[PDB]
DNA sequence: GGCCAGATCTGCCGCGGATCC
DNA sequence: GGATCCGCGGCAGATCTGGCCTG
Ligand SMILES: Nc1ncnc2c1ncn2[C@@H]1O[C@H](COP(=O)(O)OP(=O)(O)NP(=O)(O)O)[C@@H](O)[C@H]1O
Ligand SMILES: Nc1ncnc2c1ncn2[C@@H]1O[C@H](COP(=O)(O)OP(=O)(O)NP(=O)(O)O)[C@@H](O)[C@H]1O
Ligand SMILES: [Mg+2]
């Protein structure tokens with residue numbers, strides 16, 4: 111009953127291959143940068159909001175670029191508005 | 201620490217090691233005296 | 245630190261075999277278009293520095309490859325550096341094997357003085373800010389990383405603001421994460437740097453010198469950003485941050501780019517360079533090599549005498565000009581050959 | 586044309602009462618921070634020159650500045666006065682208030698400063714601006730043509746950037762202005778070069794020349810037509826007189842990449858002297874020449890050549906740290922000028 | 926020679 | 939070989955100073 | 960004395976050179 115959010119399938123397979131943990135896995139459309147016009151609508155945030163039921167913990171496995179940090183901040187703000195304790199990797 | 205000066209000078213001349221690399225090697229050899237005695241006795 | 249030998253082949257208009265400067269104060273004498281600047285530039289580039297000139301214009305007319313070779317010994321031990329300048333690009337061979345240029349960043353190196361510093365002192369705001377950034381960047385890489393991250397975040401937020409709307413607080417927090425760190429680092433460096441400059445300049449002239457840095461966001465980036473929303477909406481650009489600071493040099497409490505003559509500005513530039521040399525020497529433990537070009541051109545007798553007195557107490561230095569200082573070893577340059585009587 | 590007398594009050598750190606230069610070559614000698622540059626700048630301003638902020642030329646803790654000059658040209662003497670302060674400049678000619686455009690007709694003076702090197706060792710924009718202002722100093726149509734071309738280009742770029750529309754008249758206007766600007770530039774540069782070459786040959790031993798690069802040498806319309814795809818793609822006009830380049834050559838090589846300090850200084854001085862000679866041959870009588878810090882970065886031969894060339898001028902004033910040999914000299918100490 | 930210098934210096938440490 | 943760091947170049951906007959009625 | 964215009968310092972966005980890591 112653990113959920114993680116990832117940019118793309120590549121990091122999904124990279125994280126699952128090492129196999130530290132097993133849980134529900136989610137993939138986004140991509141990063142969040144306004145230079146080439148990708149807003150929240152162009153991503154799959156709507157789909158993520160359907161299945162918050164039964165979730166007790168969510169971890170945001172996101173890249174180290176500035177776009178990744180902005181996406182993580184936006185997701186943390188939104189989930190805190192809904193209300194779920196969140197964590198991020200070191 | 202004045203003794204290590206001669207070791208650093210000797211290690212600096214050999215090719216492939218920079219001036220800072222020699223100090224690092226000498227420091228790594230200071231507290232690993234097990235292999236250090238063997239290293240001196242390796243060729244002699 | 246001490247230089248022992250310098251050899252070259254097909255560099256600018258130079259034509260020589262070897263040059264062995266003595267330990268201590270030295271000098272060079274030559275007429276117009278002889279090669280003093282070329283020799284100093286070659287030494288600076290050989291010891292791992294950065295030359296403002298383009299790479300493709302550092303070779304002779306007709307040839308296609310250049311060679312540089314220096315032999316320097318330090319408190320640790322002797323080693324040899326070698327550069328192969330050519331069409332492909334620079335390559336470095338420390339003691340005989342390929343070495344990345346970033347490795348030489350840990351070596352003592354050398355500092356070069358040229359009228360470019362004088363131009364930078366009397367320049368616009370952006371040139372002064374760039375000079376401060378480049379000066380601070382030589383003491384840490386974290387500063388460069390923070391600058392790159394801040395620039396990327398600022399570009400992202402400006403692009404978002406220029407057209408349309410979206411989540412905005414995230415980018416605000418992202419930019420404020422770096423602005424405060426940059427401001428704190430700048431404040432600490434200036435606090436550590438000012439007194440050395442003051443005491444160095446006190447030995448070259450009679451007036452007072454100082455520094456000043458005014459900040460648009462002193463209390464915090466977030467508070468200043470939330471207090472100028474209307475101006476941002478009207479203009480369409482960010483108006484607050486470390487990328488809009490102002491640095492001013494003061495002579496007797498007045499700006500130096502409006503109330504200064506040539507001699508005072510040149511003295512200020514030399515004082516800044518000497519203070520940087522002293523700080524770097526304290527940082528690395530062994531002071532670097534000092535190279536001065538056109539030491540006493542636009543100065544009167546008293547200032548020249550004061551300049552010569554200060555450079556006599558340094559470990560090793562090399563001065564160049566059209567006249568020979570009294571009481572120092574002198575070498576002559578004629579059409580590219582250096583002969584020492 | 587002779588500058589008979591010059592007075593001032595509350596101008597920078599000057600604290601003199603009168604200064605009477607003699608005919609022919611003269612000299613000024615002083616140490617650092619004494620007021621040679623201030624005196625030369627005041628003399629330049631008094632005759633209707635260009636310069637420092639207008640509010641920064643007043644002495645510390647004061648509000649009013651006064652400059653007065655008396656010149657006796659060939660036809661007849663006349664006086665000038667300047668008032669500086671918070672309100673602004675008040676130029677009056679011989680008692681009657683008048684604008685600066687009237688003084689534009691008078692000969693004036695030429696000032697040589699260390700600021701002229703950047704026209705040689707600077708980027709493309711600085712060289713283009715220097716050429717533009719040098720041409721504008723001789724003709725009045727050039728400024729109007731430049732302003733009209735700038736406005737037309739701004740309108741065309743603004744229209745092109747925001748989507749698309751009909752671009753027929755803007756191209757016609759741009760071509761109609763560029764075809765005249767380029768022709769005027771060519772006509773001026775065809776005559777300017779030989780004088781500069783001769784002057785530099787007199788001053789030094791190498792050879793100097795000029796090179797102008799034109800993107801649209803046959804027609805603005807055809808150049809615009811032959812680049813429409815990339816013009817629409819990038820969104821900016823890529824041809825026209827506003828993208829030409831000017832290069833100074835020493836022995837057939839660019840000066841901003843190979844020349845040294847002495848060669849660049851000699852080239853700048855030669856350019857200024859050529860401009861002075863052209864102005865003298867155009868207006869009718871040579872203007873007064875002012876040279877500041879004449880002989881620092883030059884060797885013995887170059888200094889001797891410069892002095893020999895300057896010896897033949899109707900009037901000149903030189904300032905520097907060392908007195909030239911064989912000429913009258915005046916010293917400056919803490920802002921006051923005293924003469925033997 | 927050069928190697929022998931290293932050999933004798935190693936005994937000191 | 940392929941991606942990024944950092945300096946140089948070009949055009950647009952707001953501000954100061956001269957001119958007019 | 961009010962008002963239109965002309966010129967220049969200041970800043971953001973696009974290009975381009977030379978060094979680097981991965982393989
Ligand atoms: N790549 C090059 N190949 C050959 N000659 C060159 C090259 N670059 C510059 N020169 C020449 O070298 C001379 C400039 O040398 P430089 O080292 O600048 O002289 P300098 O002694 O500093 N002179 P100065 O500072 O003017 O008193 C000039 O004659 C140039 O034409
Ligand atoms: N507005 C001012 N009010 C009062 N004093 C001033 C003002 N501007 C400059 N000064 C003083 O005048 C000095 C500059 O004088 P300046 O005329 O430039 O000297 P100079 O003889 O040309 N010196 P140098 O070119 O260095 O050999 C400054 O250092 C101040 O002491
Ligand atoms: Mg030189």
Ligand SMILES: [Mg+2]
Pocket residue numbers: 505506621622
């Ligand atoms: Mg001066």
